[PDB]
């Protein structure tokens, strides 16, 4: 199945090279990872830590940081930002 990201999420995905308005969840996840790399948001020493507080992504997550080892803040943002 395919989902429709809301505007600020779609702006993030497009910034990471995505095209179009609909995506599989797998590709949303791909482009969110791409975004974090492109924007250099991960900690250089502890690379599971994403420091997103200064970025639109952090605004959208409602958080300054998250760990890739506990993605619950992503699932939350996704539930709020995907029109199914």
């Amino acid at each position: 199945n395919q989902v429709r990201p809301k505007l600020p999420l779609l702006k993030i995905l497009h910034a990471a090279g995505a095209q179009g308005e609909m995506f599989t969840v797998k590709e949303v996840m791909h482009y969110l990872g791409q975004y974090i790399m492109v924007k250099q948001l991960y900690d250089q020493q502890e690379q599971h830590m994403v420091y997103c507080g200064g970025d639109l992504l952090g605004e959208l997550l409602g958080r300054q940081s998250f760990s890739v080892k506990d993605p619950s803040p992503l699932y939350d943002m996704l539930r709020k930002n995907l029109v199914t």
Binding site: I36, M37, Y42, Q47, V68, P71, L74
Partner: peptide, 11 residues
């Protein structure tokens, strides 16, 4: 483990 590698855990 690099960020890109960690991100591959997410499924």
């Amino acid at each position: 483990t690099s960020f890109a590698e960690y991100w591959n855990l997410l499924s």
